[PDB]
């Protein structure tokens, strides 16, 4: 059900059939580890977002040829060597739909976002920005301070340390009946093997904002950044069907 992979050696120069733009690889860098071609996340002491001044993760955004704007999975591989400290949470990437802010305390009438956070103890959670001004009958599903999290009971210790963590995040917009939003949209996320799907969500106002970018921007946080120097290891970036 791979649609197509990122080709790292193009992440800075393109992305190939990914449409790759807006990068920031920080002190990040693609390398080879583990006889893999991966990008080593450096995530510094006390970096985390902008209210943390040190320098950690790296950001990027897709619109691969083939992304289905009506439902979309995207996946990864995630590498932690023992000793890493997950600290309170913390971003990995996911999908936008629309256009304007859903992330960081901002939210849009014309926006969304379904994002994969790790959380304490290497946990896992789905973790979702609605649009302003609408409906939703998800208890909690406000567009109001922060993101919004899902699978908290679900993903405990999910992320192993030396090993190959593989990571999914599906989304697939609601329907619209007379250009009303019907409350039926989708997301699931999976974890070494394990989904979790949310059902009963309306991702956008009308039939014309949909799924448009995977955007990628991984750091500590917030509201707290990395209790020291360290690195984790991403690779095999997949765009895979719903
Ligand atoms: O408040 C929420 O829904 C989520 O917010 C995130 O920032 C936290 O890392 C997570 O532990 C919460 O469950």
């Known amino acids: 059900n791979v649609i197509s992979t990122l080709d790292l050696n193009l992440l800075t120069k393109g992305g190939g059939s990914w449409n790759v733009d807006g990068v920031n690889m920080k002190k990040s860098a693609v390398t080879t580890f583990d006889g893999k071609r991966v990008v080593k996340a450096v995530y510094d002491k006390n970096s985390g977002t902008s209210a943390n001044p040190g320098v950690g993760g790296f950001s990027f955004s897709a619109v691969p040829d083939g992304l289905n704007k009506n439902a979309i999975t995207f996946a990864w591989e995630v590498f932690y060597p023992k000793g890493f400290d997950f600290a309170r949470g913390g971003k990995h990437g996911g999908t936008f739909i629309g ?62 340390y030396d090993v190959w963590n593989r990571i999914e995040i599906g989304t697939k917009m609601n329907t619209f009946k007379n250009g009303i939003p019907q409350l039926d949209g989708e997301s699931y996320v999976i974890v070494n093997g394990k989904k979790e799907v949310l059902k009963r969500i309306n991702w956008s106002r009308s039939p014309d904002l949909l799924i448009s970018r995977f955007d990628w921007n991984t750091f500590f946080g917030g509201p707290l950044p990395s209790p020291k120097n360290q ?6 970036f997949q765009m895979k069907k719903y």
């Open 99 to 160: 256009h304007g802010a859903a992330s960081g305390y901002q939210h849009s009438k014309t926006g969304a976002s379904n994002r994969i956070m790790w959380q304490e103890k290497g946990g896992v959670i789905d973790y979702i920005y609605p649009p302003s001004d609408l409906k939703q009958k998800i208890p909690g599903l406000d567009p109001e301070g922060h993101g919004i999290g899902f699978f908290q009971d679900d993903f405990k210790n999910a992320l192993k």
């Open 231 to 236: 690195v984790a290891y991403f690779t095999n």
